[PDB]
Amino acid sequence: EVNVVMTGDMTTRLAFAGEQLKQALVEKGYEVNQTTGKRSIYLNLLNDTTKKNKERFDISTKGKNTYVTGYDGNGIIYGCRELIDQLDQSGTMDFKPVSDAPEMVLRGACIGLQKTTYLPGHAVYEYPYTPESFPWFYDKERWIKYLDMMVENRMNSLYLWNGHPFASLVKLKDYPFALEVDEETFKKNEEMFSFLTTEAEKRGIFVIQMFYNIIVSKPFADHYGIKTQDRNRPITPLISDYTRKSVAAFIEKYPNVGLLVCLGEAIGTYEEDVEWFTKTIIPGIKDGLKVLGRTDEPPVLVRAHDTDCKMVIDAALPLYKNLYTMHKYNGESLTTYEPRGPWAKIHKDLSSLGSVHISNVHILANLEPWRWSSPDFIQKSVKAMHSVHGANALHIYPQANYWDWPYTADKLANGEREEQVYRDWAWYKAWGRYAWKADRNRLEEIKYWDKQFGDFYGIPAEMADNIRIAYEESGEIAPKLLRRFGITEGNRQTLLLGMFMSQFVNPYKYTIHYGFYESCGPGGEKLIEYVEKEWKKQPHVGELPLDIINQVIEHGDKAVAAIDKVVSSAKKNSDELRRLQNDMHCYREYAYAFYYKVKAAQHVLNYHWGKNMDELDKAVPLMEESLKHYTKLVDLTKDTYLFANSMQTAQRRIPIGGDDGNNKTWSEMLVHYKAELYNFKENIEMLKDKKVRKCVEVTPLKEADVKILNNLTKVKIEKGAKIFSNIDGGIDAIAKEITGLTGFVFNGEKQRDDATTIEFECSSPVTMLVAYFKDDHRKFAKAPRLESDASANDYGQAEPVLTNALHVKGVALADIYPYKFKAGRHTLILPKGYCGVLGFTEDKIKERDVALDAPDWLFY
Ligand code: NA
Ligand code: NA
Secondary structure (H helix, E strand, O other): OEEEEEEEOOOHHHHHHHHHHHHHHHOOOOOEEEEOOOOEEEEEEOOOOOOOOOOOEEEEEEOOEEEEEEOOHHHHHHHHHHHHHHHHHOOOOOOOOEEEOOOOOEEEEEEEOOOOOOOOOOOOOOOOOOOOOOHHHHOHHHHHHHHHHHHHOOOOEEEEEEOOOHHHOOOOOOOHHHOOOOHHHHHHHHHHHHHHHHHHHOOOOEEEEEEEEOOOOHHHHHHHOOOOOOOOOOOOHHHHHHHHHHHHHHHHHOOOOEEEEEEEEOOOOHHHHHHHHHHHHHHHHHHHHHHHOOOOOOOEEEEOOOOOHHHHHHHHOOOOOOEEEEEEOEOEOOOOOOOOHHHHHHHHHHHOOOOOEEEEEOOOHHHOOOOOOOHHHHHHHHHHHHHHHOOOEEEEOOOOOHHHOOEOOEOOHHHOOOEHHHHOHHHHHHHHHHHHOOOOOHHHHHHHHHHHHHHHHOOOHHHHHHHHHHHHHHHOHHHHHHHHHOOOOOOOEOHHHOOOHHHHHOHHHHOOOOOHHHHOOOOEOOHHHHHHHHHOOOOOOOEOHHHHHHHHHHHHHHHHHHHHHHHHHOOOOHHHHHHHHHHHHHHHHHHHHHHHHHHHHHHHHHHHHHOOOHHHHHHHHHHHHHHHHHHHHHHHHOOOEOOOOOOOOOOOOEOOOOHHHOOOOHHHHHHHHHHHHHHHHHHHHHHHHHOOOOOOOOOOOOOOOEEEOOOOEEEEOOOOOOOEOOOOOOEEEEOHHHOOOEEEEEOHHHHHHHOEEEEEEEOOOEEEEEEEEOOOOOOEOOOOOHHHOOOOOOOOOOOOOEEEEEEEOOOOEEEEEEEEEOOEEEEEEEOOOEOEEEEEEOOOOOOEEOOOOOOOHHHO
C-alpha cells in the first residue's frame, strides 16, 4: 500500500518525521512499510547550515512517488507536517508540490513555573521546581501532548519562566547549602529536564530557561543572613560568585538548553544591569562553554524589560557576539494591529542590530479570563510585527490565566478544571500559522478557519463560519476599550472587571505612563480630552471615545447573534461551544455596561466644565442602566468562572486592589459599583438641598515616636529646611499636612551613588512619607512603578497620598508616597537618586492634590 523510505543523515529529527508520517497514514487506513514499484514517499535529509535554507523543505511528485527534501532536521519535520496537513484537508495521497520555509525564525510559547500568589517563605517570582508546587511538570503524557501540539503548529521554541531555577537544577561544591529541593526531587528534576530536552530535540524544539535577576536561593539567603532579592541592594562579590557558578553549572549540565535573561526586576539601576550582565552572567556562560570544549557562542536571549537595551547590547556585544533581543508587543496586553509611537521606535532600534528580535505577546491582562482567538486580529498583528516593529521571531503567553497553568479560570460542574491546551487550541494554532506566513489571502483563511472550527465542533464548515464571526467580532472589544479608556497595559489593571467613574473622569489620578496612549493603537482622544475640546470649541482628531463605545456594542451584538445560531448544531465538544456562547454573552453585557458608564462619565465631565446640575441628573439613569448590564454579567459569570485576574495580589490596583486574592470576581465588584452609585446619589441630594460637598480638612500629621537605628541627620520639615546638604536652596512650598514632622537631610550625590537606607523601630504601625520629584532627569529617584517592579507595592507605596505637595528651591516639585509598617524593627533601601524622607506618623492620611475640585469628588 505505502512505502516510507528515509534517506541521508540518520538523525533523531528524520526518525521522528518518519514515525509521524507512518502514524498519520495508518490513521487514514493505509498499510505502511518502513526502511532506510508501488506508492512510495522518500524522506531525504541533506546537510546545510545556509541561514537561508533553515527549516526549508521541497515536496515534489513523479507518478506514484513523492519526494520530501529537508534542508535540515526541522525542514524534514515540516515537510512531513505539510504531507499530513494535505492528507487531512483532502482524504487523498494526491500531493501538491510545495517549497516552503517559515518567515519568523523562532516561533514559540511559554509556560510559567509561577502561581496566582506568593509561596509561603518566598518573595515574588520564587518557586522551587517541586511536585508539591507543580505536579503537571512531572507528567510525561501531558508533556508529549504539549510538544506534539507545538509540532502541529510548527513552533520550534519552548520557554520556562521562573524567578531562580538554578537552586532546583544544579549543585555547587562551594555552596552545597544553596539547594532549594530535597535529593529525591533533585533527581526527578534532572530526569524531567532529560525527558523534556530529548523529546523536544527530536521535534526540532529549542528549550529555553528564563530567569529574573538578582535573586538568590532561600537557604543561601538564610545561611548569609541576607534577602533572596532586594531591588535597590548593591551587587556584592558573594552574590556575583554564587550566580556565576550557578550559570556555569547550568550550561555544563544542560548544554542544549538556552537562557532568556531578564535584567530585572531586582536590579536598581541601568549601570548595575550592564555590570551584572557583562561581569557575572556572560563570564558564567563562557565558563560552562569552556568546560564543554565549545568554541562557538550559542545564542543568549535578553529581554528589553526594565533595562536600557542600548547600554546593555553595546556593552555586551564585544564580550559575546550572539545575543537575541525580546520586547513586549503591546506591553502586557493585546491592544492593536496598528502599533506606533515611542514603543514602536524601541522595537525598530532593537531589530536594527541585524540579529533575532523576538516579539513577546506578554501576559494578556486585558483578555483575562474569557475566550479570545481572532484569526483576523492575530494575522494583522503579525503583519505589524514585521512592518512596524521589524520583529523576525515570536514568543506568546497563554491566552489567559498564565499564573494558574495548566488550567483556565472556567468553573465546570462539581470542581472540574478546564485545560488551557484544550480551550485555547485556536490561539496557539493562529499565532503559529501567521508566524509561519503572515501574508495569506483573507477569503482562503476564512475557509481554513471555518473547516478547523467545523471539524472541532462536528459542524459543516458553512455553518461553522458563525463561530469564526463570534471570535472576530468579540475579539476587537477588549483591545479597543483598553487603548481608548485604560489606565495601563500592565496587569496592574484587570480590564474585564470594569472601571470606576473616577477612573473615567480623572484617569491621571491612577498614574498613566508616557508611551501607552502614544504607542498602543491609532492616535486619538481620551474621554477627558474629548469633553474639554467640546467645551473649548476645538476640533477633534483621530480615534474618538464615543465612536469606540458605539463600535464595541455593535461587536457585542454581532458576536451574540452569530454564536446563538450555531450553538445547538455541535455534534462534538458541545459543552465547550455552550461556554463560548456564554463568553460572547459576557462580552456583550460588558460592552453595554461600559457604553452606559462612559455616557454617564461624559455628563459628569459636562458638570465639571459648566456646573449645570441637570448634567448630574442625566448621569444617574445611565449609571443605573450600566448596573443592570453588570448585574446580568454577574448572573452569567458567578457559576461559570472562578475569577477574572490570575494574578491575585496587591500588585493589581485597577479597578481596585487585589490584595490577598480579594476583588477577583464580578460578584465582588458589583458590591463596589452599587456603593458608587448609592454614594453619587447621596452627594447629588446634598448638592440640591444644601449646595455643599465634602472636602479635606487640612491639618498637620502628628509625628510618630520612632527610633532611628542607622545614625541619620534629622531636620524639622518646614519652609526653609535644607533636606539636601549639597545644595543651597530650602523648602519654599509645603503641604500643611507635612509641616512639623521630623525628616532627614541627605547628600543628593551620595544618594546617586549609594541609595538611601533607613533603619528604625516603632512600637505601633507608622507611615513613612517619601518625596519623589516630578523631573525626568536621571539624578532623581524614580517613584514606584508596578509595571517594571513587582515589589513597588510591598509597603503600600504604589500610589501617592499627597500630590504637588512639596517644592525645594533650585530642585523641583514632589509627590509624597506612603511606606506602611506594622510595629517592629525595619530596614528599607529606597531607589538611588535624589529623594526626601519627610518623617513618620501613626495618623490616618487623607489623600489630596495640594495644587488645587477634580471632577471625581462626587464618588467619595
Ligand atoms: Na533592570
Ligand atoms: Na520582554
